[PDB]
Each structure stands twice: as structure tokens, then as C-alpha cells.
């Protein structure tokens, strides 16, 4: 329960103090990873349509790749661990949402799947594990019941985004969720009602919003956009409190990448495409800290930080996923 609270000194290592502790390789670009809620496991997905499950303890220290799953026929684009069960939800450009039961080492295929109308872009498990939020290329957000496979949407169509959903995340308590879209909006949603509470328009000066997460206390949203700026928003007021600047480039549009907190939310981390390095700022002041050279031979499209530890995963178009940890 250590987190950012601007209403009321950091207590964790900068990004620059982390080192690569394990490298894994897919047969195509690796553009998604996710942490299990307990932080012990990481799943990686690739354009080679396969999924790896990785044990963080083995990576720190028997093969770290404890699972490989092959039940997609196109790039996997999103992943979410079931909060209580040994199940991984997977979303692909092959229009499917797959559920994998990974309790058995031998398991290769998914047990159930949802066939979708659009390519999946972002999923977020409800902390109960009974529901999954689904962002697709289509502007309207889907709530699926994991047990009945019925799908539900807000009763007010004006709530919806007006372009592809890029990210969906529940907050820590499930009373809210947050979406970011190609329409350049962040939307705050009621987790029970499933109505849109707030729309942050031109959240990143008109550019696509690539990622939006909550701070642990749910008082803030951290977002990033294709204006290559990370922002800390205060939900209560609807305003940007902190601007994390310095990343990006001139001349071409940047590819999609995440801005994350470290486990204590002392730092905001954003991969920079210009240098293949990780920008790191103090979260409270926006002070630029040391740049972390990532060692990737191409752009990092996905970064996920451990919820519990000073660990994170970087996913690259070089086909590789690098596990980072402050030893």
C-alpha cells in the first residue's frame, strides 16, 4: 500500500538501477506482456501467435518458460491473468479471445474462446474473475461474462469512444475502469453501472492515447499518448497535475507504447523509441532521472512493471522479451 498521493522522498530504485536478468525469444515481434496479480508470473505474446508463461523466480535464479500456448493464428495483442484461477485470457488479431487453463504443463490449446467482430486490442479481467473488459478496433467497449459468454455494453451509446480502444484497465477496487482510445480521449467508467463518468478530451493534444492506468489509491490516472508525453491526471478535478516530458522524436509518428508506474509508484517509466531506452521520471515532481539503456535491437511496444517487486518486462519488435530486476 505504498503509492503516489500528492494530497498527502521516494522508496524504490530508479529504472537505471535495474538489470536484465533473463532474455526470452519469440519467432516474431513481441508486443504484449502482463503480470499475474501476485506478481510471480509473466505472460508474453507475439506476432508468431504464441504465448509464453514465465516464472519470475526462475528468471532471478529448471526452465523459466514454464508454459507455451499455441491457440491463435495471428498476432496476440493482449493478455490478462485470471485473478484466482490458473487461467490466462488472450486476445488476438485473429478476432478471438482465448481462455487457457495453464495448471497442466502439457496444456497447449485454450478450453473456451469468444469469436469477436473486431481485432482485440486490450483486455482487463475483473478482479472477481467473473468478467472481462474487452477493447477492440471497434469504438464500443465490451463486458463479457466469463461463465455465460454473454456480452454487455453501456446503455448510453454516447458514452462510447469514437475510435479503436487502445487500453482498458480496472482500478484496484473494481469500482472504476479507464480506457484510452485512438480518438484521443481518456474515459473514466463506473465499474458497476458501466457508464462513462468522465471524458478527458484531447488528453494528449489530439494524438492517440496509448495507455491509461490507475494509481493504487485510484486518485490518479497515468496516461501516455502519441505526443510522447506521459500525464498524471487527478480524477477528482479532471485535470493534469504532472507532465512527464522528454521522450519521443520529430518527423514521424511514434508507435504505440505504455507509460507505467514502478511497484511503489515513485517513478513513471516510458520507453523511448528514438534511443531504445527507458525514460524515467520522479512521479511526484516530473524530475527526469537516469536513462535506462534497454539493450533491444528494435522498438519496445510493451512494458509491464511488477505490481509487487522492482521488476519489469520489456517486449520488443526484435522478437525478444527482457526481464528486468534491481538485484
Amino acid at each position: 500500500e505504498f503509492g503516489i498521493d500528492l494530497e498527502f522522498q521516494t522508496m524504490s530504485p530508479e529504472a537505471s538501477e535495474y538489470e536484465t536478468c533473463y532474455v526470452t525469444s519469440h519467432k516474431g515481434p513481441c508486443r504484449v506482456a502482463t503480470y499475474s496479480r501476485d506478481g510471480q508470473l509473466i505472460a508474453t505474446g507475439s506476432a508468431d501467435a504464441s504465448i509464453k508463461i514465465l516464472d519470475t523466480e526462475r528468471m532471478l535464479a529448471n526452465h523459466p518458460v514454464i508454459r507455451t500456448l499455441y491457440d491463435h493464428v495471428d498476432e496476440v495483442t493482449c493478455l490478462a491473468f485470471h485473478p484466482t484461477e490458473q487461467i490466462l485470457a488472450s486476445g488476438s488479431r485473429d478476432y478471438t479471445l482465448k481462455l487457457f487453463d495453464y495448471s497442466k504443463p502439457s496444456a497447449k490449446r485454450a478450453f473456451k474462446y469468444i469469436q469477436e467482430a473486431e481485432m482485440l486490442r486490450s483486455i482487463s479481467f475483473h478482479p472477481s474473475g467473473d468478467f472481462i473488459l474487452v477493447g477492440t478496433q471497434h469504438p464500443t467497449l465490451r463486458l463479457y461474462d466469463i461463465n455465460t459468454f454473454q456480452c454487455f455494453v453501456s446503455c448510453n451509446p454516447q458514452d462510447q469512444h469514437t475510435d479503436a480502444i487502445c487500453s482498458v484497465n480496472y482500478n484496484s477496487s473494481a469500482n472504476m475502469y479507464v480506457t484510452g482510445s485512438k480518438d484521443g480521449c481518456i474515459k473514466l467508467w463506473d465499474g458497476v453501472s458501466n457508464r462513462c463518468i468522465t471524458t478527458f478530451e484531447k488528453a494528449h493534444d489530439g494524438a492517440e492515447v496509448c495507455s491509461a492506468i490507475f494509481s493504487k489509491n485510484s486518485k490518479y490516472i497515468l496516461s501516455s499518448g502519441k505526443d510522447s508525453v506521459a500525464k498524471l491526471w487527478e480524477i477528482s478535478t479532471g485535470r493534469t497535475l504532472v507532465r512527464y516530458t522528454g521522450a519521443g522524436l520529430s518527423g514521424r509518428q511514434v508507435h504505440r507504447t505504455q507509460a507505467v508506474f514502478n511497484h511503489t509508484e515513485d517513478y513513471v517509466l516510458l520507453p523511448d523509441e528514438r534511443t531504445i531506452s527507458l525514460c524515467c521520471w520522479d512521479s511526484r515532481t516530473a524530475e527526469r532521472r537516469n536513462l535506462l539503456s534497454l539493450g533491444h535491437n528494435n522498438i519496445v511496444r510493451c512494458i509491464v512493471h511488477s505490481p509487487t517487486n522492482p521488476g519489469f518486462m520489456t517486449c520488443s519488435d526484435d522478437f525478444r522479451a527482457r526481464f528486468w530486476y534491481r538485484r
Partner: peptide, 14 residues
């Protein structure tokens, strides 16, 4: 955790 109130919502078919 609270749960989504699906009755306050409308079914959707892609």
C-alpha cells in the same frame, strides 16, 4: 469487489 450490474446494461452481439 463489487460486480458489474449487467441489468443496468444492454446485451451486445458482435
Amino acid at each position: 469487489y463489487p460486480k458489474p450490474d449487467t441489468q443496468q446494461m444492454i446485451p451486445f452481439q458482435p
